[PDB]
């Protein structure tokens, strides 16, 4: 199989829900239903800057030489700051210093696990390949984005994450990785008829709620909820089965950093697992890093010593489209940078 | 090189002539002359993923490959896809494939099609039972954010979609080589901020790549910039030729980016001493730059117009800001039924 050789995050200072309420960015009803405590917010740091910083951390920990990094993939879900510019080449220039292929991979909030899929294949496609770097980075600022209200129920963070995947060795083994696609749901996140062509553009601003309501009215709530539930179930069961494990075999579940209401509907009141078995407390203080959530969550569990050698971790990620990815990761040893 | 091209296609909206552009004040006479563009495909109502999906329907139908045999869908683009936090690749998959393999975006600015081809090749090769992959491109380069004539003087940007179906099973052409080169020292040329510092957080509402280029060159040096670009292009060319066991003289047709005449002459005609008549120059100058899509559209043109004969070799040439370069040698095995004589 493949190994996680390194990982890291770069998170700008948090803004608390209390500060957000006082600043008017946020209403009480939303604070209450999401149960968020705080979210990382950048000042001047741009998406690729934060990704390269996380990447520098992940690479240092991995100890992998630049020449053994055979691919760089940068994932993100929002504007990277400069049109017709190569943010992955920035990540490569600053964090890696080598000349392998560097490109972007996007799959909305599932982008990190999507990049992991392509990185796994790339490493397996040739016998001499060693490692791949995956990064994520996003800066969810005005004018085009409202971290509290553009997609109500999820509060968006600024920051970067990174993971080093390796065929040679590492502190954890990737026991399975399964990705599920249900493209009938793609219209849920755009204008135009759900089952026809998209409408004309909308750069500022992001308003996901209206598009969802329109989708549901056309396809029906029954259809929408059932297709979403089914896709999530396929990813879970596929990943667990591929790893020879059941959900009871899992010590910690890395969930997306969504608000409480969404996490309860999707996971807690569905799978009947307890919050303490998940990254809920970490996520509710961090915010949604898009495709980066499973990397940030795994890094936190490992870094804080909350995952022990021999224990299995389940990564859970979902993106508009829809796409789902689940992965089972086995911790082999506590890395030197952990507690 | 045991991969095949099984299908390809394009969907191009109606052309706007340079004459129309000149009359509209979108183009000046100096630019028209220097680029020698005749026309550019321009979309009216069509959006990027819509055009990509149309090209994919064409590519898939031509390939005869079953949707179930499509194991990966990659959609490449260089500009805003029309909706944020929305998945254009899933639109492409819903409309053109109707299957449930992974579907995602790959970007590498104007090298995005070949970058997707690199990842698709690896994906197909990574498990013994995988069959085909679909790569698409699509962009719509409209005002106010973009000026297709002036945002990047020297290249005129097109709206349109392209698609290619790659297969391990079989197809009408064989992928003999594909090589990608990366020179990330050049990344600053296409953004604000210091070339060797962090990107500026100040967004440039109207894209002006010429301003960014001038700032980069003033800092990194003109000589350094030209040479590093030249070298990257040379590495990709020679690498792809060597990997295919071929020399430039063995290549019957060259698919070049749809840049303006001045750029093509500097980068290719006066450098490689190859004939414009041996390239897709005439097709490109009527189509415009489709970003990562050029090599697909150019290859599609050559095959569909019957200009490539069985046994003959084709060189695909692609470059993107970053910079990244990709070249590929494709061998035509048979004239596909959808082609002309
Ligand atoms: C950045 C956008 C993105 O990719 N988000 C990940 C996908 N979005 C979600 O998973 C949010 C949860 N939404 C759903 O499960 C379905 O769409 C529902 C259940 C039909 C509506 O959800 P709701 O808005 O009520 O929370
Ligand atoms: C922005 C879309 C995109 O990715 N385009 C591919 C990269 N851009 C180009 O290749 C344009 C040609 N530019 C170059 O060859 C180098 O930048 C030079 C040689 C340093 C300056 O070229 P010029 O702008 O004078 O034509």
UniProtKB/TrEMBL annotation, chain A:
Keywords: Acyltransferase, Transferase. SUPFAM superfamilies: Thiolase-like. One of its GO terms (molecular function) is acyltransferase activity, transferring groups other than amino-acyl groups. Pfam families: ACP_syn_III_C (PF08541). Gene3D superfamilies: 3.40.47.10. One of its GO terms (biological process) is secondary metabolite biosynthetic process. Residues 240-330 form the Beta-ketoacyl-[acyl-carrier-protein] synthase III C-terminal domain. The keyword Transferase applies. This is Daunorubicin-doxorubicin polyketide synthase. It comes from Streptomyces peucetius.
UniProtKB/TrEMBL annotation, chain B:
GO terms for molecular function: acyltransferase activity, transferring groups other than amino-acyl groups. Keywords: Acyltransferase, Transferase. Residues 241-331 form the Beta-ketoacyl-[acyl-carrier-protein] synthase III C-terminal domain. Signal peptide: none annotated. GO terms for biological process: secondary metabolite biosynthetic process. SUPFAM superfamilies: Thiolase-like. InterPro entries: ACP_syn_III_C (IPR013747), Thiolase-like (IPR016039). This is Daunorubicin-doxorubicin polyketide synthase. The gene is dpsC.
């Amino acid at each position: 199989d493949l190994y996680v050789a390194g990982c890291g995050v770069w998170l700008p200072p948090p803004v608390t829900t209390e500060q957000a309420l006082a600043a008017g960015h946020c209403d009480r009803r939303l604070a209450s239903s999401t149960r968020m405590l705080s979210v990382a917010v950048a000042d001047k740091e741009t998406p690729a800057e934060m990704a390269a910083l996380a990447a520098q951390t992940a690479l240092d920990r991995s100890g992998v030489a630049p020449a053994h990094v055979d691919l760089v993939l940068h994932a993100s879900l929002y504007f990277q700051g400069h049109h017709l510019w190569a943010p992955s080449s920035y990540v490569q220039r600053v964090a890696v210093g080598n000349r392998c292929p560097a490109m972007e991979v996007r799959q909305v909030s599932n982008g990190g696990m999507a990049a992991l899929e392509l990185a796994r294949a790339y490493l397996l496609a040739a016998p001499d390949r060693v490692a791949a770097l995956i990064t994520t980075g996003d800066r969810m600022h005005p004018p085009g984005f409202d971290r509290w209200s553009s997609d109500p129920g999820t509060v968006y963070a600024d920051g970067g994450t990174a993971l080093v995947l390796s065929r040679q060795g590492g502190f954890a083994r990737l026991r399975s990785l399964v990705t599920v696609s249900e493209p009938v749901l793609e219209g849920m996140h755009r204008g135009g008829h759900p089952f026809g062509p998209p409408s004309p553009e909308e750069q500022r601003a992001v308003d996901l709620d209206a598009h969802k309501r329109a989708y549901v009215a056309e396809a029906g709530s029954s259809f929408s909820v059932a297709r979403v539930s089914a896709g999530q179930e396929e990813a879970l069961t596929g990943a667990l089965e591929a790893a020879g494990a059941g959900l009871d075999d899992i010590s910690r579940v890395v969930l997306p950093h969504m608000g409480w209401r969404r996490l309860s509907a999707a996971y807690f009141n569905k799978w009947h697992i307890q919050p303490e078995r998940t990254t809920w407390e970490f996520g509710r203080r961090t915010g949604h890093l898009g495709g980066g959530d499973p990397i940030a969550g795994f890094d936190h569990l490992v870094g804080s010593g909350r995952l022990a050698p021999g224990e299995l971790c389940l990564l859970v990620s979902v993106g508009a489209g829809f796409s789902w990815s689940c992965a089972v990761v086995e911790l082999l040893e506590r890395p030197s940078w952990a507690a």
